[PDB]
Design a protein around this ligand. Structure first.
Ligand SMILES: [Zn+2]
Ligand SMILES: [Zn+2]
Length: 376
């Protein structure tokens, strides 16, 4: 007998289907007649996808500048897994882990290659903080919480070390079971060519920034280093953020056939409440407005995100996987979407998350409670 049954759900290809959940796992999809302890009829008026994954957040509550609560950036916005993008290094990762034990959202962390994390804005300026043994110990200590490494390779972070930290990060990668490595880009030095040459089958975030280390050359074409990196299997993550997303860069790259592998927000409390990010749903909506299809955007926050961070039981609406689901609507609601270059774009439709299902347990969002429709 099922724990939860969603009837007449709409998949992102617009087909109607039923989704049965048993013991925190997806039990079945399709036409379902077996009994359930709880049944919800979505009446064809809400999409259901695998639980959204935000591959680039800052949800360490004690981080001095880029802080947020995991559940404020997770379930409250329909997102069932968040991945902290190196807010902590080895110095603060234990406290981070202990605080996240209570979160309803599934929280994983990318470990900053610098021991001090985002305690300071120049964490790669001192090579002594880029400590391999500290990271080895941290990884051994939290083998399931830490899912990869973070290196912010830009001018204000490396100080006078240039490209040397990325080399270290690569070495560090090798020493820890070849964990995924997320590389932030923006201002130079180092140059984009030098950074991308060091990467291999690795994730470049802020992939549509309008800073000098943008993936487009001044002629409006893709940098050849980025073409070869993509050839080698390097992936692009959006990591919108406060200053890392340009509508014009993204439009041009998307016209060149260079779509993001994953969409992510680079969200923290300030750009959620005040800044141009607001939520993963709104970032996704910006990519819908640029012209990507709904299946593509949803893939960018589910199966592709789970593959890129090796989250084996997340991101897939398949029998036997974790019962993390997002229930949402594409609502006609004229809205101004603002990028990091302060450029506005009028959009007619936006994604509105209505509920997050986590381990088979439902949680309405604010909008989900307002619209009523269904309850858990
Ligand atoms: Zn960054
Ligand atoms: Zn970030």
């Amino acid at each position: 007998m099922f724990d939860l049954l969603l009837r007449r759900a709409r998949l992102v290809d617009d087909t109607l289907t039923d989704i049965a959940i048993q013991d925190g796992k997806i039990a079945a999809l399709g036409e379902i007649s077996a009994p359930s302890r709880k049944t919800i009829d979505l009446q064809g008026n809400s999409y259901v996808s695998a639980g959204w994954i935000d591959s680039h957040v800052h949800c360490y509550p004690n981080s001095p500048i880029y802080h947020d609560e995991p559940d404020s950036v997770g379930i409250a916005t329909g997102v069932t897994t968040v991945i902290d993008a190196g807010s902590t290094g080895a110095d603060d990762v234990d406290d981070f882990y202990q605080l996240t034990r209570k979160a309803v959202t599934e929280v994983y962390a990318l470990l900053n290659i610098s021991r001090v994390g985002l305690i300071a804005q120049n964490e790669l300026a001192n090579l002594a903080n880029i400590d391999a043994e500290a990271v080895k110990q941290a990884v051994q200590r939290h083998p399931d919480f830490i899912v990869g490494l973070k290196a912010r390779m830009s001018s204000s972070v490396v100080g006078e070390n240039g490209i040397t930290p990325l080399a270290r990060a690569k070495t560090m990668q090798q020493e820890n079971g070849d964990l995924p490595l997320m590389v932030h880009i923006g201002n130079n030095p180092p140059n984009l060519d030098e950074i991308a040459e060091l990467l291999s089958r690795d994730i470049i975030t802020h992939c549509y920034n309008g800073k000098p280390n943008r993936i487009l050359n001044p002629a409006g074409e893709l940098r050849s280093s980025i073409t070869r990196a993509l050839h080698r299997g390097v992936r692009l993550d959006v990591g919108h953020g406060t200053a890392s997303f340009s509508f014009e860069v993204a439009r041009r790259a998307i016209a060149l056939g260079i779509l993001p592998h994953t969409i992510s927000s680079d969200i923290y409390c300030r750009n959620r409440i005040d800044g141009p990010v607001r939520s993963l749903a709104l970032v996704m909506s910006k990519f819908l407005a640029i012209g990507m299809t709904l299946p593509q955007v949803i893939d960018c926050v589910t199966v592709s995100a789970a593959e890129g961070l090796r989250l084996s039981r997340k991101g897939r609406l398949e029998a036997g996987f974790d019962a993390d689901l997002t229930l949402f609507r594409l609502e006609r609601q004229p809205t101004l979407l603002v990028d990091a270059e302060k450029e506005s774009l009028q959009a007619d439709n936006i994604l509105v998350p209505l509920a997050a299902i986590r381990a088979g347990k439902g949680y309405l969002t604010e909008q989900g409670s307002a619209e009523h429709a269904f309850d858990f």
